[model samples]
Target: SQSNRELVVDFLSYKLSQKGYSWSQFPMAAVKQALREAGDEFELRYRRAFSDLTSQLHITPGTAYQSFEQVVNELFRDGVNWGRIVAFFSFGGALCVESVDKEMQVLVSRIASWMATYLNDHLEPWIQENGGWDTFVDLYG
Candidate 1:
């Protein structure tokens, strides 16, 4: 059976592979794919919250990161969990998606890049303490 992580990894990874880039670095494609797909799936899982986040997001060049910080923090006001993690990633995906429509092509990649960096810095440590990605696989896989 496919977990959210697996599906996300497969989807995001394949798409990126098609787009073409240097993918021979550390942490590699698997991790990148997983996080990207998490962004891909979060919106699906947390539809209403995702809705509000996107509606209020204002992803202009200047307000992008600021808006993300405000909304994302609000999301975790209650606490952290695997489900919310999915939504967080999904929010990033939706941001990127919206950028494409608005023709902010430069902002698209930055959304994910910013997202990955944000998660790595703020969310990654929490994820590790909460049983890590492997445990998440067991719970949701």
Candidate 2:
């Protein structure tokens, strides 16, 4: 009994998850998996982007904050940027106005908030764990 709207939302979430940028404390495996799933086209482009970011991370080694900035920068370079988080508001509004149960709306907001917060909160710790952020940031910021 899934609705068309539900399907569309699920598909979008699935596509994002497949892109390997969802939220993982250590997402190297997920990233590799995403690359594999992305097939030839997206994989190639992502690899090139990843490589470019990695080089930028290496450019400044002494400053600790620089690593965090680099990671944030690289993430920005990729469509997975942070400030663009506002897009989720638009997406929520679209999904919200659609016909659905009030509970469903609540659930959607909860799930979306959880996902976004998980991703955001983990970034700094991950930066610390993986050689102070730049290497991991370069991989995925």
Candidate 3:
């Protein structure tokens, strides 16, 4: 069990480092809060899905809108889907509310809006298959 925990930490550390993040700059508190909120929204099984973005946001501080943009861009690089997009936007929403930085809040809102548009335009079929976005919130949240 201890070995498993150690392995997870090591893997996470390596991933963070590869993503240009360090534990020193990691926003552990805010990230944990965001993850906890996502978990509470019935995303326990998909918790690790957004770890990369979380680590990026953690290492990004201040009015670093560019850093947020970069992370969001990475999130959308592969494709857009309903659940995954919802998860990260929820994370951003959580972070926005909890953040003390006014500029950061504005940046988060802009990012969230961008994701919302993508979800509506590109992921509409997926949402419909899942019984629509309203059903998604009802089932997941």
For each candidate, give its TM-score against the true structure.
Answer: 0.66, 0.25, 0.40
Instruction: Looking at model 3, report the run of 10 residues with the lowest lDDT sum.
Output: 23-32
Model 1 C-alpha lDDT per residue in residues 1-141, reported as the tens digit of each score:
123344333443343443352222112345445555555455455555355677777668787566677778876888787777777766655555556556675675556555665666677788889987766655554
Ranking by TM-score: 1, 3, 2
Clashing residue pairs for model 2: none
| Candidate 3 per-residue C-alpha lDDT over 1-141 given as tens digits, one digit per residue, 9 for 90 to 100 | 232233223333333343344422112334333333444453445555455665667733454555655666665666666446545555554444333233343343344444444445555566678675456445444
lDDT of 3: 0.46
Give the top-scoring candidate (TM-score): 1
- Say what the RMSD of model 2 is: 18.0
Worst 10 residues of 1 by lDDT: 18-27
Q: Where does model 3 exceed 4 Å of error?
A: 1-39, 42-51, 54-85, 94-103
- Where in model 1 is the C-alpha error above 4 Å? 1-49
Residue 97 lDDT, candidate 1, scale 0-100: 50
Q: After superposing candidate 2 on the true structure, give the runs of residues whose Cα lies further than 4 Å from its correct spot.
A: 1-36, 39-41, 46-49, 59-66, 77-118, 122-141
lDDT of 2 at 89: 23
What TM value does model 2 have? 0.25
